[PDB]
Amino acid sequence: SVRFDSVGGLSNHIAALKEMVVFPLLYPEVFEKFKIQPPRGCLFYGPPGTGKTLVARALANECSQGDKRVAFFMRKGADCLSKWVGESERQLRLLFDQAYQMRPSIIFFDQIDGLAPVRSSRQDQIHSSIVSTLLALMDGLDSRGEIVVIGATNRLDSIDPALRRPGRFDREFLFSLKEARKEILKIHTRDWNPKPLDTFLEELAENCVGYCGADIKSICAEAALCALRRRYPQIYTTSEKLQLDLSSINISAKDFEVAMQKMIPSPGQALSTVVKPLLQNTVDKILEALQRVFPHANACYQPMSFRPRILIVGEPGFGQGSHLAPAVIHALEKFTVYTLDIPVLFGVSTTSPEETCAQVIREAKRTAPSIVYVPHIHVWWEIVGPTLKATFTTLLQNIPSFAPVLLLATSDKPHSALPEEVQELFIRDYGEIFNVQLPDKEERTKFFEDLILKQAAKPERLKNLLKTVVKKSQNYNIFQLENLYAVISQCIYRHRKDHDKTSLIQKMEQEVENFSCS
Amino acid sequence: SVRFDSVGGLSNHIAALKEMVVFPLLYPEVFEKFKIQPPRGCLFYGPPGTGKTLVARALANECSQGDKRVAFFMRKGADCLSKWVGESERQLRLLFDQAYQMRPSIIFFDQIDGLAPVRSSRQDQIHSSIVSTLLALMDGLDSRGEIVVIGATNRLDSIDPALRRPGRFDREFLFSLPDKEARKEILKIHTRDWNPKPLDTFLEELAENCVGYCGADIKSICAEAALCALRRRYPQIYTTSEKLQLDLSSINISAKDFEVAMQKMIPASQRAVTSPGQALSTVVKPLLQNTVDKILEALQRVFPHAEYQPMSFRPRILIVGEPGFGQGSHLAPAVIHALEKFTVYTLDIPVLFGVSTTSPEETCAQVIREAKRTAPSIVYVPHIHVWWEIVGPTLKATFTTLLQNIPSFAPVLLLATSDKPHSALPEEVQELFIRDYGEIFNVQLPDKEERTKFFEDLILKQAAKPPHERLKNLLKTVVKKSQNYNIFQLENLYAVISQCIYRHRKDHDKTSLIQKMEQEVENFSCSR
Ligand SMILES: Nc1ncnc2c1ncn2[C@@H]1O[C@H](COP(=O)(O)OP(=O)(O)OP(=O)(O)O)[C@@H](O)[C@H]1O
Ligand SMILES: Nc1ncnc2c1ncn2[C@@H]1O[C@H](COP(=O)(O)OP(=O)(O)OP(=O)(O)O)[C@@H](O)[C@H]1O
What we know:
- It is classed as gene regulation.
- This is part of a larger assembly, with two copies of chain A.
- Chain A is an alpha/beta fold.
- Chain A has 20 helices and ten strands.
- The first copy, chain A, has helices at about 10-25, 50-65, 90-100, 110-115, 125-140, 180-190, 200-205, 215-230, 255-260, 275-295, 320-330, 340-345, 355-365, 375-380, 385-395, 420-425, 440-445, 460-470, 480-495, 505-515, and strands at about 40-45, 70-75, 105-110, 145-150, 175, 310-315, 335-340, 370-375, 405-410, 435.
- In chain A, the strands form two sheets. A five-stranded parallel β-sheet of chain A has the order 2-3-4-1-5.
- In chain A, strand 2, helix 3 (about 90-100) and strand 3 form a beta-alpha-beta unit.
- The interface of A and B includes residues 83, 117, 120, 322 and 347 of A.
- The structure holds adenosine-5'-triphosphate (ATP) (2 copies).
């Protein structure tokens, strides 16, 4: 039922899997020209929840539909278990021949852990002969095509070590657990009478942090199930269905949100729904400046730079590391990010801090371009020992000059107050230091539109009130603004069940005048 | 016998279970359009003695004598094992087929771990064969409709994960320890058929005390008290070989019997651990209940999540009082105990250093991650004036940087107490607590009425029982002369007066010790 249309996000995995597995089986005479000798053993491995067997079934559909030029047999290495001496043994030679009498073919082996476990002194002589003669079945009945052994498992070490030898089972395909999620939401709701809004589904996928595929459909089914709970609360404690129209179970804005809150669900995090219209301008500005310094976000017509470096400096309480920098990291996605802070350096024992400080830089060198994050450099410099500072400096210096790896750091004290070793590390004469500024008047004006007023009247003079709140908030930092918002929004809850107005507005207007934060 | 009546306190897993057993048999239409396909395997788990077998017995009786007809089939741990090589796996299939031929039926398995262990290569192969042949015919349950198999176990871990899969066992029910309202129902249930029915106010007065008990513990004390009353009424029976004569009507159960019965018993869950929470003793309650109330209402004002959705923003608070004001030894345990149902993780010197082989930063890491996992949660840090001047700078930096990562609106409270005032407190800590948040409380000395009530029980009520105005004068002068004392000194004076009262237990006339009482009352001197 799936022909590469119920798969979301896997734009690059498909190209690799088809080119090195199916195409050599789809076009075997081509590789006779150069003698590539493609491997005869392939695997699907990764964390659970990646949907490994469905890909094999899709390959079966692709190969079977047509002229039957390449085939596929579906097999499981966990239901192929026979409690007899050698009866499950014939399954592979017949299968490696049944798929060979009608070759080419791809044979899937789900959970080979049971059919071919680790033969040992505790395992049955049955399974001992099974595994021995079984590896004899595969390494002997291969090496000329056109059978490519594809298997799946949850753990890589759950395989008999004699299987993974030269000239035997070799290849491994990494399946991992957000760009896939838009495609997933598009696909899995292909036939829905209450078709949700595209922004509705995008918010759904945004709020489904940590889910991998199956639970993505599970939440949708659960949302429908609780929709018929909420629209029809009388389903409990009622007689047989007498009059129920099964069309008012339509999913609206609040249905999935009440559905999401009924189960438990990196230094990059976008702003909240309340914070976005306050710092979005500054995030865009810093992104633009970074574009200017860092062009990656002999021969010409190729981007090049000289040691990408940048420092965020702002007065404490300006949210330069509390809200800005993780947001910038989130905005500059599709690049590897690697932090270096105290709980990641001292948070693991059985290792010297020097032992991990080299691994991050080495592996970020491997995957250039990469991002290294060092928050609160003004305090991180005074916690490490004398050797760590020197090791950090030498590791940073050993980078190539034209390597497009960016150093991102944030600070609280002004640049002129830092230790001198930091000072002769940034080039303020260049574009390497960015300043954070207080929000302007429009942002503060638009920060209070929702509560004043789009929900208070939900079942004048307050406008003067409104401007007074702004008339005092010219020079308050982010934390004071947000705490003020929370304290005002509390009173709105305080009189939910008071239809009579002019008494709640009195208490709001007297609390705002009473709010002293000098 | 029992029909869903004696089972009280849950009231929620019964509704979802008749929907499993009865509703599909009566309403085969709601499951038609939506393709509901209700699940067929339930997995009872939880700490022992909280149910999960009483429910099975109630269900068995309900289906035996409810809507005819449903059959009950049950095993005891591991009975499929036989001596021969073929009957070990054949009896299972035989009884399973016998159950299928008797549709409809219900299958009950208890002690799953005794028949379905965790498969591995470090154990015998016969168990591997039996678990495989068990999960074989279980997977083919869709074809053999109207067959439901349920399981009762105690250890979640000791089950092979291969069975805990959609297709075999996709549903689990957790049976945890009961709460106050549920305990009241349990006490009402187990004393139901008592001829002098006790009054309800006594029942929840008692149920306030029971904090760690379960079903079995609650049941047992109702027999312990009866035997204690039996002993109290007729203490001539034990040292006797021959039978005697009893009237059977002089026996009556009083509150003292319950008190002494609870004295010797120990809660089942606390036979290997002591929780970091205590409630005020009876002698102290009329001296700090008001302040516990005021702290509770203030924290409710700042942290309203304990009253569509209340909003909170990094709730914090710090109780500050003089050294002798009992802020770290009485008030904080009271606050932690009055806010039940909240998982609280503590953090003090016997926690960071009280454990070996683990550097303090590691322990802080597990603590903070597990406090974020189950929110709302409480972090306990007592004596912050001392916890801070002993730890290394690295630990301070880790502690400060690891709580800045929290979601702003999460209902996570920081709880701490101090002995020095806020101003003298280290400045680099004072940024965590800001006055406009209302995070600062000052414990004050109790007023005149509180002392008057505190000493009112000793005099003049205890000094009146055989084995008046002068006592009023003595109370007056004592209440006057203790107007500048802290909690420790007050309870010390209480103790010395009580001891002097004890020392004249056998004096048959008063007025011989009133002069004593007054004389050591003057002999008291503390001066802080
Ligand atoms: N990434 C995914 N995309 C789509 N469907 C998925 C995904 N992951 C899981 N599913 C669905 O949930 C089911 C559970 O996956 P599956 O059991 O095959 O994975 P697993 O956790 O490795 O378990 P096991 O190997 O024991 O079967 C799949 O059969 C499929 O229906
Ligand atoms: N909610 C309850 N109401 C009344 N009695 C209860 C309750 N929970 C437990 N009990 C008492 O506990 C007794 C036995 O408990 P039960 O066998 O149900 O526990 P279990 O956790 O399944 O046992 P175990 O783990 O030891 O196998 C019951 O006979 C009953 O007296």
